[PDB]
Amino acid sequence: DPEKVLEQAVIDMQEDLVQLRQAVARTIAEEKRTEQRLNQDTQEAKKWEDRAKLALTNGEENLAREALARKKSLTDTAAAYQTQLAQQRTMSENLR
Amino acid sequence: EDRAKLALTNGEENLAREALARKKSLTDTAAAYQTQLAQQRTMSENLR
Amino acid sequence: EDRAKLALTNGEENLAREALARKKSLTDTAAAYQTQLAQQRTMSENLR
Amino acid sequence: RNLAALEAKISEAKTKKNMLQARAKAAKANAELQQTLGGLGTSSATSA
């Protein structure tokens, strides 16, 4: 009977749309986690910059350049996480 | 409403607006009971 | 429609257009039920 | 110098691979959701 078949098809669509809600919730967690990662990496980059300011105040340009190399690594890693975040933002909107 | 008049006499407009929100809820509930009463009036006359 | 009037009073044209899209869906659904009702009226008179 | 280079290479390689795996899995999940949203309900609609 076509009425029973189309009712069952719409029931199966309830299970599929619940899987799509789980995929949205996963994608939402990935954007939030990559934001959290780049936010803490940029806060650590400030700590290493302040360690460089302390080293320069003591005249240790060697330690200041080493601390700035940590700053460079962290800000480049945060830019990689912003690039990943752009993929998660567009995917999150696509599933939405 | 009289609690709101006391609040306004004390200058507490926050408490006056909160008391007026109770007034709104009660008068809307009384209008729901008047709507129910209209159904009971017509049913009472129908059975009579 | 009254939710759209509240949204326009707050300046939220986005929410007003979204509420008007609910109004459109409901009035089109009511016109479908009026079209169905016309079939039931003629069938009711035919059986009568 | 060999140890310092070795640890730097390992640390960068592992973290770049891990974030690439995570973003690749998220990208294919978003694409799979477009394919299910395009294909779902079709056999039920034809049967109705």
Add this chain to the structure above:
Amino acid sequence: RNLAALEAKISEAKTKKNMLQARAKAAKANAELQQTLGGLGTSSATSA
């Protein structure tokens, strides 16, 4: 000097961990209360 540094490190680490554990538990409890306030009564409302 080793003992003075060791006791300072232990004291700071333990107190920072303890307050972080307490604030993390409070934060998840507040979030769980938003989820229950959003989800509660829904099946009873549908049944009514």
Add this chain to the structure above:
Amino acid sequence: FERMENKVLDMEATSQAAGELAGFGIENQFAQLEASSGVEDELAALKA
């Protein structure tokens, strides 16, 4: 640090699980209700 990181990942997952769904239109209706409550406070101030 590993146990704390597992709780941070649980809090990020919880924050996405709320954030990708809980943006409900009813929260704009609650903001319109708060504006209506502000109008009742302004009417009480006008009466005073």
